[PDB]
Structure 1
Amino acid sequence: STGSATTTPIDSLDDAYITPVQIGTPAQTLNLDFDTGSSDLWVFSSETTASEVDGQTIYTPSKSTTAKLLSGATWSISYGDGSSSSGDVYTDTVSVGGLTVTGQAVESAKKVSSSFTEDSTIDGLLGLAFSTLNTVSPTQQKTFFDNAKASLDSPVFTADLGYHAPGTYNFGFIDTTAYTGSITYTAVSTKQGFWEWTSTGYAVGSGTFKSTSIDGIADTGTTLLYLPATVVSAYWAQVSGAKSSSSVGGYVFPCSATLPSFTFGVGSARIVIPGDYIDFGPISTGSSSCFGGIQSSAGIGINIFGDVALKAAFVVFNGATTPTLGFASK
């Protein structure tokens, strides 16, 4: 089997991407944030504290004839941005782009943190990291990909995120028309539960490539590109007037600037992030100070190849017995 679904930016800055997901019988369609940096499929629901729901579409298990309470199971998760959610668990039928899993753990939120409430466009998350990170207790549950894998034509999914435009998540096949040149594959460590890999280096604008190993995660659920302070300083040094602002919480730059590109290495291959992908706009409405899309990972404890990086590539998440990641230009 295969599936294919369009993923759409939630706003004009590509802060995140939503993909429609069919849950239950009859289908209830919710728009979920596909997140290769976590492993829980959770949704706003009829069980969510009413004051914490503000415009989201909810899953109502009582209206699904295939929903079953997973007795005794609870979940609770926190993300890198300090947001969180928790609740109980149903199993139900879940379909993405024509690909159906029966008995998928659908984690129903009883509580969500303010950032989720305040974002009307995201109805929940669909985790695509390794199932070892799944938070369901006392019986850990499998991700949608993990459940689908054996049925897929090939045990892979691909992320093709757009810049200020829709893109595609495919399951079970590689669309050879969706990228240019070749896909370069690189090793993955699953030791921390993430799609963790090692970039071979970077360049800033038209500058020379620096060969250096950069361990990080391919994370569709993180907006920006978070790299070591040395790398980030080298990037922003090429932008006149750019500075790290403690008050804003990162590098900012004059909105009048033309940003240089940023290249990262995948083996001997190179992925180029155009300068425009690194502009996240005014820090506040009407400001001429703009927020940068490349930020320091110092104090995160890990480097994160988030959407800024991934949207410059066609990315293969290869879930073979020994997982690997593939990157192609597009």
Structure 2
Amino acid sequence: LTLGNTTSSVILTNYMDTQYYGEIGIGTPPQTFKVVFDTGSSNVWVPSSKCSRLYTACVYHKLFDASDSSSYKHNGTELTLRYSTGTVSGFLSQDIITVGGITVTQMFGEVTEMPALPFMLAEFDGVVGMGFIEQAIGRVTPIFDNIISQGVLKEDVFSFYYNRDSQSLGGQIVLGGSDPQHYEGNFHYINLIKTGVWQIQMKGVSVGSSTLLCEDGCLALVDTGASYISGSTSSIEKLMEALGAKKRLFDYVVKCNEGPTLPDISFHLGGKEYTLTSADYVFQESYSSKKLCTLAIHAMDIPPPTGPTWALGATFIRKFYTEFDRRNNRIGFALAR
């Protein structure tokens, strides 16, 4: 392991408080893609020019053309990548990737099968996995491991800032450090249960003053690629009953006029309570008694080995600026500015 002095940053675009994406350049000359930086996965993928136009998601997204890149190195190995909302498949390729002004030779997936549900809803083209090699499909070296290998970064850390929707900064990723302009106070660290996954121990979930859930302890995946806070179907049913929310097909809702009256939700992580008020978890679209307002908390049954687990996504990161520490296998949280 080599350390330099360089800190690099990627400006993110906030789409509806659900999608935070930045830009990467792939190839020579660079082909630009809108990408989500996901701590819950470890593969890099973008849609391929080899994607059949009968996949409508491929008509609506930027496609990587290897035939236009002079730095491209063929691989051809087939791979399937499974997410919570859907699945993508294609093959592996190698090329130069630029992310925050850091140029790295990276093995990535060229997606040839991209389903309209959910990919037509995606403002981003692809994904940049910020997880560990242990989660990488095809044991492909992740981009952050390749960036560490260069020995340019001041520290083996990366930090996430997700803003509240607005013509301001959507968010920001710092490679090799943190940005003090985006947090206040000091970081409180929670060690990873084990290397290989950005997952920490959770000591309890409170609805108001009472610790209703996770009383005997549970898991919390700190996931930048997840839009919401998620728990198991069972945990979410208890949580929603306590809030007074109604289950719909894809989400939970409350009558808009009752959004501001909902109790605080607290997450016990390390030696601290991480509290979200209703303003932090309700999509307060109106105050009308004749309208339904969505919550930024969903049921998600994450399969083993990673799951059953809670996932602390954009809902959580908006309130708490997050530092992912590779050198010490820990996650730091500080109050976001």
What band does the TM-score fall into relative to the shorter chain?
Answer: 0.7 to 0.9
Q: Is the 8 A contact 1:156 1:173 kept in 2?
A: yes
What is the identity, as a one-letter code, of the residue corresponding to 2:180? T
Give the percent of matched residue pairs that are identical in Structure 1 and Structure 2.
Answer: 25
Cα distance in 1, alignment partners of residues 264 and 136 from structure 2: 36
What is the identity, as a one-letter code, of the residue corresponding to 2:71? T
Aligned to 1:288: 291
Aligned to 2:120: 118
Cα distance in 2, alignment partners of residues 120 and 304 from structure 1: 20
Q: Structure 1's 49 and 277: CA in aligned 2 closer, same or farther, altered over 3 A? A: farther
Q: Equivalent residue of 1:66, what SS?
A: coil
Aligned to 2:108: 106
Q: Using the TM superposition, give the Cα deviation of residue 181 of structure 1 relative to its aligned residue in structure 2, in angstroms.
A: 0.9
Aligned to 2:223: 219
Q: Equivalent residue of 1:48, what SS?
A: coil
Cα distance in 2, alignment partners of residues 291 and 195 from structure 1: 27
Aligned residues: 312
- Which of 202, 207, 213 is the matching residue for 1:204? 207
What is the identity, as a one-letter code, of the residue corresponding to 1:148? I
Q: Is the 8 A contact 2:19 2:123 kept in 1?
A: no
Please tell me whether residue 327 in structure 1 is matched to residue 333 in structure 2: yes
What is the identity, as a one-letter code, of the residue corresponding to 2:313? G
Aligned to 2:53: 50
Q: Structure 1's 51 and 276: CA in aligned 2 closer, same or farther, altered over 3 A? A: farther
Aligned to 2:134: 132
What is the identity, as a one-letter code, of the residue corresponding to 2:14? P
What is the identity, as a one-letter code, of the residue corresponding to 2:266? T
Aligned to 1:153: 154
Aligned to 1:18: 21
Q: Using the TM superposition, give the Cα deviation of residue 122 of structure 1 relative to its aligned residue in structure 2, in angstroms.
A: 1.4
Q: Equivalent residue of 1:265, what SS?
A: strand
Cα distance in 1, alignment partners of residues 330 and 135 from structure 2: 18
What is the identity, as a one-letter code, of the residue corresponding to 1:254? K
Please tell me whether residue 269 in structure 1 is matched to residue 269 in structure 2: no
Aligned to 1:169: 173
Aligned to 2:315: 308
Aligned-pair Cα RMSD in Å: 2.4
Q: Using the TM superposition, give the Cα deviation of residue 5 of structure 1 relative to its aligned residue in structure 2, in angstroms.
A: 0.7
Q: Using the TM superposition, give the Cα deviation of residue 208 of structure 1 relative to its aligned residue in structure 2, in angstroms.
A: 5.2
Q: Is the 8 A contact 2:198 2:221 kept in 1?
A: yes
Q: Structure 1's 249 and 22: CA in aligned 2 closer, same or farther, altered over 3 A? A: closer
Q: Using the TM superposition, give the Cα deviation of residue 295 of structure 1 relative to its aligned residue in structure 2, in angstroms.
A: 3.1
What is the identity, as a one-letter code, of the residue corresponding to 1:145? F
Which whole-Å deviations, capped at 9, do the CAs of 1:75-99 have from their partners, x for residues lacking one? 1111122x11111121111111112
Q: Is the 8 A contact 1:271 1:328 kept in 2?
A: no
Q: Which runs of 5+ in 1 are unaligned?
A: none
- Which of 195, 199, 220 is the matching residue for 2:198? 195
Q: Equivalent residue of 2:164, what SS?
A: coil
Cα distance in 1, alignment partners of residues 118 and 234 from structure 2: 33
Aligned to 2:87: 84
Q: Equivalent residue of 2:32, what SS?
A: strand
- Which of 278, 281, 288 is the matching residue for 2:281? 278
Please tell me whether residue 7 in structure 1 is matched to residue 8 in structure 2: no
Aligned to 2:3: none
Q: Using the TM superposition, give the Cα deviation of residue 273 of structure 1 relative to its aligned residue in structure 2, in angstroms.
A: 2.4
Q: Using the TM superposition, give the Cα deviation of residue 55 of structure 1 relative to its aligned residue in structure 2, in angstroms.
A: 2.1
Q: Which runs of 5+ in 2 are unaligned?
A: 1-5
Q: Structure 1's 110 and 182: CA in aligned 2 closer, same or farther, altered over 3 A? A: same
Q: Structure 1's 313 and 49: CA in aligned 2 closer, same or farther, altered over 3 A? A: same
Cα distance in 1, alignment partners of residues 18 and 123 from structure 2: 11
Q: Is the 8 A contact 1:131 1:141 kept in 2?
A: yes
